């Protein structure tokens, strides 16, 4: 017929309360595998541009195939195990859900489908239940949530307060209570786009979002998983207000791994990603203790660290800065670059260093020399008197 505001509101209810537990392998009667791929090629393939009838049978439908307490983890404890090595456990009856998401997505994503066709049909309580969901089926299930929550956050200026706050709560627990959660990574991406679009004169709840939530996320040990998605947030955050540069860098410094080479490398990597954008007026506030550390990194016995540390030397910009401030930097870096590199096994660094040194001459001959002087001179005494 031509009366659809009753063919779907009964067709959806069919695919709604369905509930087909695919954990017995019986009753192979699809039925619904279509009802959905239907409401799809119905709202997608220009079969419509007028399906705004006041009716939230979609939501209810969704919040029934999705909203369930996630099952008990199929992955081990967590001390002797690294999540980057967790065998993904795929949710069965995916080809079923796979659509419930798809539909709900190609739902309020389409034009003419007003926001108040949901305003009070998609309330905090819906959001929240959606959030937990951020938990286990190889990205697949997450990936969808990542997107769904994205678009919901970018259309209901009312749920922004909540979505945000409730995301924090998930992180504070990740950090201080259970050092376990699968969608931390996915979530940060969401917060990626979010940050990249805050108020020009940054509200003060964000500066707290950054300082008391984001940085502390580097403390965790499973960091190897959401590091890159994280760094982006830190960096992106510094482009929206280079004031926070100092406190962000002082944080990464306080935390800085001491028994986890791999993390030490990440920090270095993220730290360059920051210098790369650092602002001269700011670079100065950090500079001293920052390079005071790089100093140790070069002097590290872990080839992977040192290697990544010295690479700082091939950054046009980072070098640029060091120059305009060689005065102070150069001597902090010397004892370690010029260090008596004649006591190693990694037949590489010795050369990797020489190269940095050269790159340090072409910049300020005089200083370079004068520092040598100063160094040797000192070294001298510590060799004479220090032999009684």
């Amino acid at each position: 017929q031509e009366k659809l505001f009753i063919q779907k509101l009964r067709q959806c209810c069919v695919l709604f309360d369905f509930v087909s537990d695919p954990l017995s392998d019986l009753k192979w009667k699809e039925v619904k595998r279509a009802a959905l791929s239907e409401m799809v090629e119905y709202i997608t393939h220009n079969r419509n541009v007028i399906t705004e009838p006041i009716y939230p049978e979609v939501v209810h439908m969704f919040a029934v195939n999705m909203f369930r307490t996630l099952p008990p983890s199929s992955n081990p404890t967590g001390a002797e195990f690294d999540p980057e090595e967790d065998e993904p456990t795929l949710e069965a009856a995916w080809p079923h859900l796979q659509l419930v998401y798809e539909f709900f997505l190609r739902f309020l994503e389409s034009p003419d489908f007003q926001p108040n066709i949901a305003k009070k049909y998609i309330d905090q309580k819906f959001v929240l239940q959606l959030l937990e969901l951020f938990d286990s089926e190889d990205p697949r299930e997450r990936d969808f949530l990542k997107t769904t929550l994205h678009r919901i956050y970018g259309k209901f200026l009312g749920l922004r307060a909540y979505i945000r706050k409730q995301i924090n709560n998930i992180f504070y627990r990740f950090i201080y209570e259970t050092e376990h959660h699968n969608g931390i990574a996915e979530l940060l991406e969401i917060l990626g786009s979010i940050i990249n679009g805050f108020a020009l004169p940054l509200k003060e709840e964000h500066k707290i979002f950054l300082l008391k939530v984001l940085l502390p996320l580097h403390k965790v040990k499973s960091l190897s998983v959401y590091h890159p998605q994280l760094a982006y947030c830190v960096v992106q955050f510094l482009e929206k207000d280079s004031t926070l540069t100092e406190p962000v860098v002082m944080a990464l410094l306080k935390y800085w791994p001491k028994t986890h080479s791999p993390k030490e490398v990440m920090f270095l990597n993220e730290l360059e990603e920051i210098l790369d954008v650092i602002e001269p007026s700011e670079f100065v506030k950090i500079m001293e203790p920052l390079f005071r550390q790089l100093a140790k990194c070069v002097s590290s016995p872990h080839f992977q660290v040192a290697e990544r540390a010295l690479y700082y030397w091939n950054n046009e910009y980072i070098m640029s800065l060091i120059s305009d401030n060689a005065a102070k930097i150069l001597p902090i870096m010397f004892p370690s670059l010029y260090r008596n590199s004649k006591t190693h096994w990694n037949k590489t660094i010795h050369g990797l260093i020489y190269n940095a040194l050269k790159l340090f001459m072409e910049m300020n001959q005089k200083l370079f020399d004068d520092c040598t002087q100063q160094f040797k001179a000192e070294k001298l005494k510590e060799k004479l008197k220090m032999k009684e």
């Binding site: 307490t69 008990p72 309580k125 929240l128 709560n169 504070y172 201080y176 209570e177 502390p216 306080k254």
Partner: protein, 582 residues
């Protein structure tokens, strides 16, 4: 003869080399000692107070230190002096530190005089509870239990308000806290208040948006139920406790499963029969493997705790049906769990029922695929025969046991090798010597050492069961015709048993039927077998008579002290110095 070191730690508390600043703080006690109380109070605390430390390892240590200064700060009159810094450590981000900061306030709280408490200690709890940042509020919760009992009627009311506030916090995190502490906080409030005040919070935290809160509510339900007198149980506790047994989030349910026998006792011996029994089934048939196996573990203790007059009746018409189902579950951990306690039911249903009902299940498990379920059942047979007839055992169970004695998974072969000496004793030696001896002899030569070791010792326990004379006629022979196996691993097995049989074979049998072979082997090609021969003579040493000792021992225990292989050498020597033969 000096006071310099101590005076230096006092200078290394700000040394900027965290590794040192630690040590100093980590001994912060011997600084306030050589410091001198009246000082500690006016120089060391106002220093730890006006100094924000970073690195956690240090912060942790300061916190743990501060809890013992009760004395070094001058005793109870001035214990309220340690508050200021701890109150700050209570705020710290990294939990552990603030967790210890809390562990301390509690400890030193008991040292405050009620007068001080109302004046210095409560205030700290109030300030922590009202903190801008959740952490503080988190902490605060752990502090009510310890000051309430001693403050005044006026303050007790103020505290109760502040605590309800922590329960109704905008942060899941703080709520989950108030949640866990809700139990211990009730345990101190006066009765009336448990009813009018605790109860409400209890139910709310019990129906929180966050399930991770709600489940902590079930834990405190067990505590609240022990405070309330029966009657009121069906009015204030039960609505909520049933509610949780159903709760959508399997996590909440799982709790009611683990804290079941606990809830049993608290509730009553009756309300149990009224609500929990049905409720208990529900869990045994839960949708979540966990909650199921969970309840399984509780089966044995749930019953032994059922009303004295109906136990057998309900275990039979109510519980026993579901059990039979679980035995045949799909999830190992559930079969594996229930199979490790299922037997404790025998002594409840009696000789009869046990054989008509439970005994069959024992078989079901005794033969299951999952090593666990087998292993877990094999372990409680030392029993059964104390219910079923020792004949009923050796007839409808012994067969399996005879088969288990050699299934794949060695930890299981073991499980049998251990339950042997009992079966042997109960079954009788003649039964043993006939259709069971061949087994205990087989083990003596298993591929896995673990099994041989167990088997070796096993003998000593049999000789203790059937007298020396029996060994010299059914054991000592085979245990010797083994020394002829080419593989040294087995070849040694011999010297091993010997080292055990002598412990219980009188001075005779040892000297005339074992000492001969413990020597004849001292001339073996594989050194291992040689240095062990030496180590053996030291074991069967004392049991020999002085004359045999310096006759057939020393001389042959000499022909080794001068042997090639460094080991045999050392083991021959340390075989003398102990026997006192040089």
């Amino acid at each position: 003869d000096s006071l310099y070191p101590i005076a230096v730690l006092i200078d290394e508390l700000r040394n900027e080399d965290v590794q040192l600043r630690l040590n100093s703080i980590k001994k912060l006690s011997t600084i306030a000692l050589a410091l001198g109380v009246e000082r500690t109070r006016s120089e060391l605390l106002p220093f730890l107070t006006d100094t924000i430390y970073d690195e956690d390892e240090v912060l942790l240590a300061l916190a743990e230190q501060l809890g013992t200064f009760t004395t070094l700060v001058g005793g109870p009159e001035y214990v309220h002096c340690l508050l200021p810094p701890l109150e700050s450590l209570a705020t710290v981000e990294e939990t552990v530190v603030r967790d210890k900061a809390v562990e301390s306030l509690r400890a030193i709280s008991h040292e405050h005089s009620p007068s001080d408490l109302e004046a210095h200690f409560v205030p700290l709890v109030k300030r922590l509870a009202g903190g801008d940042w959740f952490t503080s509020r988190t902490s605060a919760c752990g502090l009510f239990s310890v000051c309430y009992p001693r403050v005044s009627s006026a303050v007790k009311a103020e505290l109760r308000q502040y605590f309800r506030n922590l329960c109704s916090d905008d942060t899941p995190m703080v709520r989950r806290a108030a949640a866990s502490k809700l139990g211990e906080f009730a345990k101190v409030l006066e009765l009336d208040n448990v009813k009018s005040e605790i109860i409400p919070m209890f139910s709310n935290l019990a129906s929180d948006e966050q399930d991770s809160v709600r489940l902590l509510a079930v834990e405190a339900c067990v505590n609240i139920a022990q405070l309330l007198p029966q009657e009121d149980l069906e009015a204030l506790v039960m609505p909520t406790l049933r509610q949780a047994a159903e709760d959508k989030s399997w996590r909440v349910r799982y709790m009611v499963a683990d804290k079941f026998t606990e809830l049993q006792k608290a509730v009553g011996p009756e309300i149990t029969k009224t609500d929990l029994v049905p409720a208990f089934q529900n869990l045994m048939k839960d949708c979540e493997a966990e909650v199921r196996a969970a309840a399984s573990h509780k089966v044995k203790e749930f019953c032994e705790n059922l009303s004295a007059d109906c136990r057998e009746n309900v275990i039979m018409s109510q519980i026993l049906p579901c059990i039979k189902e679980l035995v045949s579950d799909a999830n190992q951990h559930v079969k594996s769990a229930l199979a490790s306690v299922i037997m404790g039911l025998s002594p409840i249903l009696g000789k009869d029922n046990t054989i008509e009902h439970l005994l069959p299940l024992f078989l079901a498990q005794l033969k299951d695929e999952c090593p666990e379920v087998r292993l877990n059942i094999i372990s409680n047979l030392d029993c059964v025969n104390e219910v079923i007839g020792i004949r009923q055992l050796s007839q409808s169970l012994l067969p399996a046991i005879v088969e288990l004695a050699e299934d794949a998974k060695w930890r299981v072969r073991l499980a049998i090798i251990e339950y042997m000496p009992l079966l042997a004793g109960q079954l009788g030696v003649e039964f043993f010597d006939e259709k069971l001896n061949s087994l205990c002899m087989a083990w003596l030569v298993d591929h896995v050492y673990a099994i041989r070791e167990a088997a070796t010792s096993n003998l000593k326990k049999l000789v203790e069961k059937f007298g020396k004379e029996w060994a010299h006629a059914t054991i000592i022979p085979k245990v010797l015709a083994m020394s002829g196996d080419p593989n040294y691993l087995h070849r040694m097995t011999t010297l091993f048993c010997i080292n055990v049989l002598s412990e219980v074979c009188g001075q005779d049998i040892t000297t005339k039927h074992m000492l001969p072979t413990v020597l004849r082997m001292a001339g073996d090609p594989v050194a291992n077998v040689r240095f062990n021969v030496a180590k053996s003579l030291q074991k069967i040493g004392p049991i020999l008579d002085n004359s045999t000792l310096q006759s057939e021992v020393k001389p042959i225990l000499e022909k080794l002290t001068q042997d090639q292989d460094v080991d045999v050498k050392y083991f021959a020597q340390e075989a003398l110095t102990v026997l006192s033969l040089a």
